[PDB]
Each structure stands twice: as C-alpha cells, then as structure tokens.
Amino acid sequence: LERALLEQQSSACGLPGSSTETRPSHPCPEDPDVSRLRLLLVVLCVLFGLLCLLL
Amino acid sequence: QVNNKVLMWRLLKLSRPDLPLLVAAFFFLVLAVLGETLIPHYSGRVIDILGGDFDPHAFASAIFFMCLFSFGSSLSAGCRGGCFTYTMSRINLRIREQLFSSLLRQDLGFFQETKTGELNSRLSSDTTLMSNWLPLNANVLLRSLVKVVGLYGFMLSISPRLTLLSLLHMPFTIAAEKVYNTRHQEVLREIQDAVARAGQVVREAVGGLQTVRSFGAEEHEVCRYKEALEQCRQLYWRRDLERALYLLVRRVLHLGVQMLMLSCGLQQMQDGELTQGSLLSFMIYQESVGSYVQTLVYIYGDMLSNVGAAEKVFSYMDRQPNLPSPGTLAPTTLQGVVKFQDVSFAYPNRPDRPVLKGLTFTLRPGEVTALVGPNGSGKSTVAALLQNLYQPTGGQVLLDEKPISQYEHCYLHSQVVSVGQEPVLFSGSVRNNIAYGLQSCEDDKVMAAAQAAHADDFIQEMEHGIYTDVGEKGSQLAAGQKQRLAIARALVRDPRVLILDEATSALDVQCEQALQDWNSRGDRTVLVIAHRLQTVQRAHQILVLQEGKLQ
Amino acid sequence: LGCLGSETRRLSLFLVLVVLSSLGEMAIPFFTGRLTDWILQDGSADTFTRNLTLMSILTIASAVLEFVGDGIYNNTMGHVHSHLQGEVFGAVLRQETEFFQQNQTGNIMSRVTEDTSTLSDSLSENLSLFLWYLVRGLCLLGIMLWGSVSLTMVTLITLPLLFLLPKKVGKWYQLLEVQVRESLAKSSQVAIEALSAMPTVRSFANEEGEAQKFREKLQEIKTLNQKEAVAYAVNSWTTSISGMLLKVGILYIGGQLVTSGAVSSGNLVTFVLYQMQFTQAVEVLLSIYPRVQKAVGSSEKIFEYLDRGLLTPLHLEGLVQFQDVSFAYPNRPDVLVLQGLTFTLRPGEVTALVGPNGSGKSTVAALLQNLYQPTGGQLLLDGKPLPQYEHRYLHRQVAAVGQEPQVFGRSLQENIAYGLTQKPTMEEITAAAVKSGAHSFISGLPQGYDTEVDEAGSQLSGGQRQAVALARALIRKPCVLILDDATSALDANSQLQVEQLLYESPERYSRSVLLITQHLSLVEQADHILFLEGGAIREGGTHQQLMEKKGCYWAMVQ
C-alpha cells in the first residue's frame, strides 16, 4: 500500500482509466536499464548527505 | 531490447502537436504540488503562534494564507486534470485517423490474409491503450519527482541535522527491495509450475472419466488432487512468509530511524534551536517522502513495460503496400479498344499454382464479348485483371496502346467501371449509395440513371424518394431491388468499357435487356462472363477458356 | 451467507494480535505531544528518557505482533483454501453420468477449479486488508475521542461531505464518458463496414471519400470530448478543495480550544497528526468494499454447483439375466436406443447379441456395467439386484474394455493397475501382461513395466493402446468381461490373444464374457446365439442355428 500509488485512485491527483493496478503477467524479469537508475538514486543520496555534512 | 526504446521514440514523436497542452499541464502540476506541501509549514507556524501569548494579528493572517494557498492548489489541480484528459483524447482521435488513413492504401492480398475481426479489435482497442501511455505515466512520474525534490528542500530548510539523520536509510531500504525481488521471482515460477501440474492432473482425470467410473473408483483421483494441493499450499506458505519477513524488515528499519529522528529533534528543542511547529512540520514531511522516493523506480519499471502493447498498431502503420507504382497518364479521350496477350497470374495467398496462364484477348468499340467455361474457371480472376485491381504476373493488359497501370487511378476507375458478381451497397441514403465515388453530382442524373436501370418504381415508392435510407449494409431492400440499384450505380458513372458478372441470370431478363440497349447505345464496349448458354446466344461474339487457358 | 471460517480457534487469536498491534503502533504521536509539552514547561529529564524508552519498546512490539498476526492468518487461509479446492473437485466428480454426456462442456470442469482459486485468494486478500484497516480506524476514533470530543465531532460530521460530494459530482462525467464511448463504437462500426468491402471500394476509388466519412464521425465526437474534459476538471477541483479545507477548519477551531484553555498545544499536535491518519484509513476502507462486494457475489454459483449399494459376497456365482430392457439418454426421453430386449448369461459361456444396433449396444453395455440406471424393464444377477451390491465389490467383480479405451499419463505399472484397492504384485503384473499378449510390446520399452507413457497415450500406437487396455481387466480378473470396437480395427494378430481367451483359455472357463466387437472371426466362434439391432433380436438357439435358419442373422452374416 504505497500511498504514492494510492492517491491516483482518487480524482484529487489521478486521471480517468488509471485505477487498475495490475502487473503485466505473473512472472517477469527486471530490465537492466531500470536497474541502472537505482545507482543514480544512491549517488544522489550520497551527494545530498555530503552537502548537509558541510552544515 | 532496442525495439522498446524505438517504440518509445515513436510515441514521443506522435505527441508533438500537443506540446502546449503538456507544457500547461506540467506547469499546473508543479504549481499544485508547491501549493499543497506549504500547508504543513504554515500549520507549524499556527502551532507556534498558539503557544505562549496569543496575538490575533498573526493568527488570523496565518489562517487566511492557509485558505488562499488551499484555494490556489485546488484550482491548479483542477486545471491540470482537465488539460491531461483533453490531450489524452486528442492524441486518441488523431492516431485512429492516421491508422485508418494508412490501411486504405494496402493491396487486396493483405485483406485476403488479415481477418476483419482482427482489424476491428486493433482499431477499437489498442489505439486507446496506446493513448493512455504518455498522459498517465508522465503525470505520475512528474508528480513523484517534484514531490521528492520539494519535500527534501523543505527538510533542508527546517533542519539539516535531522535531514541528514533521516537520509541515512535510503540505500539499504532500496537494496532490500532488489534482494527481495531477486529471491521472490524463482518461487513465483515454481508456484506457476505447481498450479500447472494441478491443472494437468484435473484435465487428465476429466478426459478418461468413463474409464474411471466403469473400471476404477472416482475417489482414487481425489487423493491425487490432495497430493497436488498439499505441495501447492506448502509453496504458497513459503512465498508469503518471505513476503512478510521483508515487509517486517522494512517497517522496523523505518520505525527505528523515525524514533532516532524524534530523539535528536527533542534534544535540539532542549537547546532551543527549534520550535514545536517546526518539529511538527518536519515530522509530517518525514511520514510522506519515503513512499514517493521508493515508488519512483517501480513506476519507471512500468514505463518500460507498457510501451510494447502498441507494437501491433505500428506494424500495420508502416508496412509497405505491394501495389504497383502510381499512374501518370490521362487519356483525355475515348479508350477505343482494349487487349491482352499471354496473360498469366495467381493469387498471392496460394501462388504455388496458376489460376490463369497464356491468355490473349481483344475488345472492340460497339461490340460484345462472352466468356465461356466451367464454374470457377478463372472468370473472376480475368475480371479482376481487366479492372486492374491486382497486378498481372505474366503477359500485358495494355489498353488504348498504353500500360494498364500507367493511367491515373481516378480516370481508370471512372472509365472502366464494372458490375460486381453479387450486389453490395454501403449504408446511407439511396441518393448517396447510388453515386459512391462520384466527385460531385445532381439529383436529376441519379433520377435519370434509376429510370435507365428500370429501378425508378422502387425509388419513387420510397418513404423519402431518393433521400430514403437503404438500412445497415443494404439489408433494407429486396435482392432484385439490390441488383437494380447496383446496375444504376454502374451506369451513373457513364463508363466507356463496362463488364458483367452473370448477375442478370438470377435477376429479371428485363435488366439484361435494358443493359444491352443502354450501355451498347454507341461506341461503348461491353464484356460478360456467365455459365448460361442463353447469354452466349444473345452475344455478338464469344470466347472460350478452360483449365486456366483459352480453348 | 455460507462462510467456511471453521478455524475459529486459530482465527480468534488473529483478532487479539491485530488489536494489540494497532494499540502498540500509536505510541509515536501521543508521546511526541506529551514530551513536547513536557520540554516547553521545563519538566524532568528522567521522565523524558523513560518516555522515550517506553515508546521505542511499544513501536517495536507493534511491528513484531503485526508480522506474527500476518503469519498465523495466512497459514490458516492457505489450509482453508486447499480444503475448499479439494471439496469442490470431489463434489464435481460425484455428479451423474447423464450430466457429463455433453462433450462441448469439457472445459467447465477444467475452469471451475481456476475461477474458484482466484475467487478464494482475492477474497482472502480483501478480507485481511478490510479487517486490518477497520481495527486501525476504530482505535484511531477511540484515542481521538479521549483527546477532545468537540474537536473530533467536526472531523466526524465532515467525512460524508468530503466522501459523498465527489461521488455525486462524478455522475456528470460518468454520463459524458458513456456518451463518448458509444459515439466511438459507432465510428469504429462505420470504419469496419467500409474495410469489409475492400474490392468494391478500390474498384470505385472511393478511399479519400472513406477517409472523410470516417473524419466526420471524429469531428462529431470532439464537442463531447471537450465537455468530458471540463467535467473531470470540476470533479478534480471539488474533491481537492473539500479534502484540503478540512485542515483549515480543524486547525482554526483547535486554536480556539487552546485559547479557551480546554487543551494544550501538545494535545492539538497529537490531534493534527491523528486526523490525517484517520482520513487515510477511512479512505482506503472505501476502496476495498466494492471489490469485496463484487467477489462475494460470484461465490453463490460455486456453492450451488457443489450442492447440485452395500451387498458384498465372498464368492461370485457368475449368473446374469435381462428382461424387457429399455434404455435412453436422460436428456432426450422422447427417443430410446432399444426397448423390450431380453438376454441371459451363464458361467463357462459367452455370447454376442451383435448387429447394426449403433449406440443401443453401447447403452446395453453401460447397463451391464451399471454406468446408468435402466430406462425400462428390470434385471438381476447371482440372485441379487444390480444396484444392491456395493460399488467396491461390483467394480472388482465385473469389468469391460471401452469402445474408446485409453491409459492416463503415468508409469506402465500404474496404467496396468489403475483403480486397484491394494498394491498388485510385480509378478502378478508380469503374468497379466503375458496373459493379455501385450508383454512383447511391454518388454520393448526402455524401462519395461516401469516405463512411463506420454499424455493421452501419445507414446504408443492405437493397437499398442488397445493391447495395454485389454490387460487391465485381466489384471483385475473380474468374473464378467466385455470388449468392443478394438479387434475389428486392429489386426487379427493383435486379437489372437483375445481369440485364445474366447476359444480355449482355462481361466475363461471359470468366468463369463459378452462380445460387442465388430470382427467377424470372433462372431463365428461364439457359444450363445444372440444377435440384434434397435433392441430387436434376430437370432436364437445357437449362432450355428442363426446361420442355418437363413434369417436376419444369416442375412447380416452374408
């Protein structure tokens, strides 16, 4: 129950036809290109941490 | 792999006319998010004002600002949701129009292969699933991204020490999801194997049932089903236990960092560097940012999975048509005669054997021709070759001393029109269905054509004359009335080289007599294909063919 | 209605675990408010560190009790799901042979376990998520009511405004969305009408006219398209403002409360923290209820689909007889395959009753096998009614090879003894394979008696399958035997073991059999005289007498 996938159920932030939250099929490998983005989130958090470490 | 990325670039290019709507929606989304997260900040300011001596002048001002920002956020959220829903529909209307305008230029062989129900499905279905891509997914991605940036900005504004202390778990919490997923997938496939094994056992027990009841015992399969379902439940239990253990580790880490954050905040409060309202606003942000920062990777996973459903529409949009090169010659005058030499061809759907070969033909102004031969002996193929609807595989079909494909499509269709084997009329009024493909016309010409085709009795008896509706797919008429309407629709274009496909054999002989009297009333040539000897007895000339060859 | 929550013991502890987890999760806001007030009035540090230690212990214990509750519930739920799947398969298998006669229905038994499984785990999830958030929401209401009655009255009265007014406003879009979708389906129907007639449209070169014909059924949608877009905008605005303005109202009226001296700032901080929580809990519960109501409403089909002898002798007498025999399909009582037939059987003998009888011979064989009740007349064997003997003794005492025999996908030692009430001896299985003559094909396998066949018998020829099926009756050794539709399609070399069994087998002299095979070579050797079609007999006295009489049996033998 990620609230960030729940708010679009309501029309306060969602759009029509968005409500059916289902994955494409039962089984499924992860794509490598989306796995690249996890490293970008980690080095972002590292740089943000080191920025606050100056303060 | 790269097929997904090129389809994404196609979907982005397909949206280019909508840039103003997508820019306005982005701008209202950024404004709505900035105006929503400000409420917790001003709510901290209110709680700071209510502690100690109450001042009306600050309290009333802070409540007024809270109203004004909540009003501005709501208005901007409404204008965003309108803009996204409008562009989503505009791209849906355009991509249907481009898809239909691309399909109408294909060869006959594509429609002989591809089923009508398949084209109905992809035109009606996948254009909607394709247009629900950019509007939904750009919205959720931009909302999550700007919410993460705004929340961490406000945390850095309120207290850098507490933000650093909160930012510590970001990596291990991300990595735990990867390690959970990469141990969950194999268990999910083994579940799929175990349920497939149970489905196989129940299917196999159904097929031989008679044998089971007659020779065996029914209950003997029940213990086999128990044995399959025991393994199924044991595997479901192991999957869900691993699911729950990950969810426990996430929370307990989350609640531990939240407690440590609160301890450091209270210690700052003791030192007096932070106010109560500041601590409330910071901890409200702390309960919220962690969902968005986690989900951003899942929605970017769904980004790269959604695009593929669209591939079938693109595969029909850019398929090269197998039709010949466009025509350029305009006769500007009567065709005179038409001829064929060594004509050979076969259907592109079964090209392993010829349907006609070696055929030579000649047609002259003011005369008639009669095709003699067995039922289905290539007569329809010879008519289709004469109308240039399919390209010849051997010989030449040159008319008026020029190549059959050299004349412009409009002029060829207007001069060489031929009556079909079975009447067909598209849905609409008779005053439109009797002149389909005419660039312009007058009701006097259609009324004269209906009289000339002996259809005037049916046309004058109608509920609105020529303006009466012919029903869906021409179903609201008699079969003889349909043949009369088809004969009028052929004569209304005034063709110079017409053809007949034995339709007057089941119809009234008065229709054949009217066609012979009116179409042959000058230089116009006509050729007919029929099995009945009565047509060959009335014909001025005849031609015999059998087994795909002339005789 | 019709709930299967029988594990009330194991389930009752889940309610204790969920309420204790919910009460324990609440430490963070309440102790934040208390500690913040305690610091603002310069209270002691000992109670401060004691409070921190207590709130840490409570929240850790809440997380652990949530996990243990989830484990206990999902273990119970997996057991009741498996039990229910087994019960519905048992119930479907118990129906009468006359229901199964519909060959086109072969997928419904293949589908009822599947939609029953997806109903079960969907309802499992929703039940769990509903019950969790209802308990969380009740605890939130309680602690807010302990906090301050006048501050919660307003947040309780305002929820129907913020949850129902968007639902009232949504009916305008829903209507415009319907009118848009209908006009779109009309426009598609015009395009598919034009596409279906491709040879005539190309002949008349009307394709730019068709592009415009389609084009007008799009321009007519744009105006409704727009209305729909503005109606969604107003819906989004009103649900945004109605939800967002409640956080103005609660803060303002709380401020007044604190000015009046009824409560302190820390109580207002806890209240602002709880309000959001209550709003999210009640908001999620409104999403689950529709899904539950949909899923539970489909279970009644499954429940009603589930709702929809004893004499054993220690020895077999082998006598049988039939009189006035009439048989028909229960779904077509207006027509019958035979009527008024009669027959008799005695140990050490065999008879045909063969002829052009069609399904009437098969229905007579199904009567001998008791696969359906007789549609007319009565019969008995060994001095007892046919349905009077117990099914376990009956199936071991008499057996028949089918007219479409097959072996299910398993080991050869499993297929050759399927339905046996006790494990057959390996030497006994070898003896049965030798007596059936199929042992020469069995010894050609890669693993002999251990060799597994492919699904539906696809690892063997039709003659190999017939030889394997004929062994099953011999391994069971029933007193009464039958076999049809095999020795006429197979070679006489494959039927040679059956011919030896019918002609001179010492084991067959201790039993009896009825012949329905179309092979003429077996018909010449038969002991008892019977031949028939449509339920009418056309032979008697002996098969030799039926030939010598020059009657209908001799005419069909010509």
Curated annotation (Swiss-Prot), chain A:
GO biological process: symbiont-mediated suppression of host antigen processing and presentation
Name by which UniProt lists this protein: Protein BNLF2a
Family membership: Belongs to the lymphocryptovirus BNLF2a family.
Membrane topology (UniProt): Single-pass membrane protein
Superkingdom of origin: Viruses
A single Gene Ontology CC term: membrane
Biased composition (Polar residues): 10-22
Main localization of the protein described in the UniProt heading: host cell
Residues covered by region (Disordered): 10-30
Task of the protein: Participates in viral evasion from HLA class I-restricted T-cell immunity. Associates with host TAP1 and TAP2 and prevents TAP-mediated peptide transport and subsequent loading.
Keywords linked to the UniProt accession: Host endoplasmic reticulum, Host membrane, Host-virus interaction, Inhibition of host adaptive immune response by virus, Inhibition of host TAP by virus, Membrane, Transmembrane, Transmembrane helix, Viral immunoevasion
Quaternary data: Interacts with host TAP1 and TAP2.
Localisation per UniProt entry: Host endoplasmic reticulum membrane
Stretches of the chain forming a coiled coil according to its record: none
Record-annotated membrane-spanning stretches: 37-55
UniProtKB/Swiss-Prot annotation, chain B:
Name of protein: Antigen peptide transporter 2
Membrane-spanning parts: 19-39, 58-78, 137-157, 164-184, 245-265, 279-299
GO cellular component, one term: endoplasmic reticulum membrane
Family, per entry: Belongs to the ABC transporter superfamily. ABCB family. MHC peptide exporter (TC 3.A.1.209) subfamily.
Effect on the protein upon substituting residue 249 to I: In allele TAP2*01D, allele TAP2*01E, allele TAP2*01G, allele TAP2*02C and allele TAP2*02F
Regulation: Inhibited at high ER lumenal peptide concentrations.
Enzyme class, spelled out: translocase
UniProtKB/Swiss-Prot annotation, chain C:
Side Lumenal, residues: 32-51, 144-152, 264-267
A Gene Ontology molecular function term of the record: metal ion binding
Binding, ATP: 355-363, 458-464, 518
Region of interest (Part of the peptide-binding site), residue spans: 199-244, 277-308
GO cellular component: centriolar satellite; endoplasmic reticulum; endoplasmic reticulum membrane; endoplasmic reticulum-Golgi intermediate compartment membrane; membrane; MHC class I peptide loading complex; phagocytic vesicle membrane; TAP complex
Enzyme Commission number(s) of this protein: 7.4.2.14
Record note on what altering residue 454 to G does: In allele TAP1*02:01, allele TAP1*04:01 and allele TAP1*x
Cellular localisation: Endoplasmic reticulum membrane
Keyword annotations of the record: Adaptive immunity, ATP-binding, Endoplasmic reticulum, Host-virus interaction, Immunity, Magnesium, Membrane, Metal-binding, Nucleotide-binding, Peptide transport, Protein transport, Translocase, Transmembrane, Transmembrane helix, Transport
Tissues expressing this chain: Highly expressed in professional APCs monocytes and dendritic cells as well as in lymphocyte subsets T cells, B cells and NK cells.
Swiss-Prot/TrEMBL induction comment: Up-regulated by IFNG. Down-regulated by IL10.
Main localization of the protein described in the UniProt heading: endoplasmic reticulum
Cytoplasmic topological domain: 73-122, 174-242, 289-558
Effect of residue 157 to V: In allele TAP1*02:01, allele TAP1*03:01, allele TAP1*04:01 and allele TAP1*x
Record text on activity regulation: Inhibited at high ER lumenal peptide concentrations. (Microbial infection) Inhibited by herpes simplex virus US12/ICP47 protein, which blocks the peptide-binding site of TAP1-TAP2.
Residue ranges annotated for the ABC transporter domain, each copy included: 320-558
TM region positions: 11-31, 52-72, 123-143, 153-173, 243-263, 268-288
Domain spans labelled ABC transmembrane type-1: 11-294
Disease per UniProt entry: MHC class I deficiency 1: An autosomal recessive immunologic disorder characterized by chronic bacterial infections of the respiratory tract, beginning in the first or second decade of life and usually progressing to bronchiectasis. Patients have nasal polyps and may develop chronic necrotizing granulomatous lesions affecting the nasal cavity, upper respiratory tract, and skin.
Protein family according to the UniProt entry: Belongs to the ABC transporter superfamily. ABCB family. MHC peptide exporter (TC 3.A.1.209) subfamily.
Name of the encoding gene: TAP1
